[model samples]
Target: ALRQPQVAELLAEARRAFREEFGAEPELAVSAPGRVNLIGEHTDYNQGLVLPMALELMTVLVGSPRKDGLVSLLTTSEGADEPQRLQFPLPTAQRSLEPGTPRWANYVKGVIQYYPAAPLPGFSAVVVSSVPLGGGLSSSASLEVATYTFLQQLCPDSGTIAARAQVCQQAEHSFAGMPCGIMDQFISLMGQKGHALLIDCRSLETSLVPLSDPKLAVLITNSNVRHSLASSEYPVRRRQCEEVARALGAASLREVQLEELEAARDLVSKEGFRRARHVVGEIRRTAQAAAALRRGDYRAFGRLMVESHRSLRDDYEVSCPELDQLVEAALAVPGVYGSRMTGGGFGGCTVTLLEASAAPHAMRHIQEHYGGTATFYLSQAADGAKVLCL
Candidate 1:
């Protein structure tokens, strides 16, 4: 799953060196994979269904409990110059806890800050990752899950899986200062191996659909244009969805079925209604697509992906010219089944399903057509969070 062969070889060497350095084998070695959304963008906060594939690109953590309060951290990417270290005192409600200062450490600290207010032991960790940062691929979520799982393993008395996941979500939301939904964190924490998870954003109910498409392969193409949700019109779009939900008299847009939207079409403004309409229709599409996947109807699923992209481009207003161009290029190619913007749009990666044999050709075509530093990757569904040992 590494993006480069050199990285893969380096990882192998790092693991061997880790084993030699640690002497005693670490108690646990875990990996928390990043995720790519096949459909359902900007719908997570609205409590909708998102089909996310757990990626092979992940953050690996090798760790064991620390006898003292100090926790040592290392990374293969950071080299052997210095290891990231932190100290945590046993929890005492009366004592004041300092907020983590470093940006990288924030993920770890955020998890600790939001972890259940129960007595938990501390552990040392060595973290390495292949997940791209700022590529809208949920690398932060992967890191959070790795840290959370490592702590859980060290402190066997910690809360349930749901509780731990929620705590990690809060860590990102409250401590990390990111206004992200629980979708990424939840999926990173609970995703199963070799399947796409259909998560109900509102209720947290999940249905696993095995992704065994022999003829189709996932191709993620980065637009080379970076975007940050906090600075963009992302908050405005979220508010619009909320407003539409209010006008439609539903708890969430997910509750507003297609029939409901048509029944009360004129009750909401055109702009508001369009957003709500996309949610309602997209939710239905997601359900249908899930069924198609279950029935092994990849063609039907591809159609849904095409429809999803159209809705995102026209109604959702998240897709930009770059994204549209990517979609156009993908569809123009002979073997591409479907293509769509994957994350919070404007600028991010495009998710596409294509004939397994045609991936390289399609990638070359898209790159040539787009004429930029566009990068293509072939990914497979992988396991959720786990500890990796040397």
Candidate 2:
């Protein structure tokens, strides 16, 4: 991938930071990739289908074992934020954990808090990442999975990818205070190279959806717009769907069809009904998109992507103006197949499926006309988390 050198630079910086912070050479390094959702927005928590692939951008932790039970970590942030360091005694139980300062440390602490290995040894580490924070690319999940991967190396019997993802998902809820869906952590732990994962959130069953066409490319355009409202609105939408699900006598929207939702319109609030509508339709779109890719139907796949964004915009009510502009600009380019807002919405990035040859044109088009500071990157599917011991 194009970002390989960037990750190598991250790792090299992590090594240098570790020695500078701990005064010793690190014994090993662990890493986990960030992810982008091609379609399927806000469907994961409803126990519906989602298609997401890991981004080459990742979080890496370089560390060495500690004899004392205190875990110390140094985290480097991008931009104007300086590096932060924090530590806590090894977590023996959930109650023993305390939240760290600067907030992001909570992601690392949260994973270690629930890593499922008792009497875990402490390690001093330097955490560095290429994943953009708060850009809807799952930087938090990447960090959490990197920590979980490191623990798996230490204990060696943590569990399967599904199991590890559950621990990380819970950490985000209990520690990070985000009621996110399982898709982020699931793909971060389970993604395969050059394939998007079609995940059944209800069953946790995943099948690889290949993006193998040599002529195809996945583009992510960051609008560099973060609405403070995004963090608060996510939970409100989740609650809306949950209420509608219970009204329809189902545990989740996954079991409720559009016909059922329409017939039982009087049973739930107007907002709740709208929320359920997006989830149900998006679920079907995700499945159809997967099949379209398998059959090499790029045109059909592109249409589904566009439909998904409108549903999220009109029904789920999460898309913002900046995201819409980016998608519109991307679509104006000649080789773009489909474009839509990805992740938890409000403001972040849009994922575009485009002809490989058109990447440069797409980038230049957005840069000139996106009407704001936008960043562009081309990504392929990447492997999941792992550790490399020195």
TM-score of each: 0.87, 0.96
Candidate maximizing lDDT? 2
Single out the weakest 10-residue window by summed lDDT for candidate 1.
1-10
Q: What's model 1's overall lDDT?
A: 0.75
Q: lDDT tens digits, residues 1-390, model 1?
A: 214413345356546645765665566777787889987777788898889988877887777776675555655644222335445664456763455554566677777666664456666666677777657778788888888877767665336666766777777776666667677877787778778988888877888889867777888888878656424577678888888789877888888887888888778778887887778778888888888889977778888999998998888877878878888889888888789988777887899888888887888788888856687778877778865444
Q: lDDT tens digits, residues 179-257, model 2?
A: 8988999999998998999999999899998886889999998898989878999999998988998888998999998
> Which runs of model 1 end up more than 4 angstroms from their true locations?
1-26, 76-101, 157-160, 229-231, 262-270, 388-390
For residue 348, model 1's alpha carbon misses the true position, in angstroms, by 1.9
By TM-score, who's the top model here? 2
- The clash count of every prediction, one per candidate, is 7, 0
Model 1 pairs whose backbones collide: 29-387, 29-388, 29-389, 30-386, 30-387, 30-388, 31-386
Candidate 2: which stretches are off by over 4 Å? Answer: 1-5, 79-83, 93-95
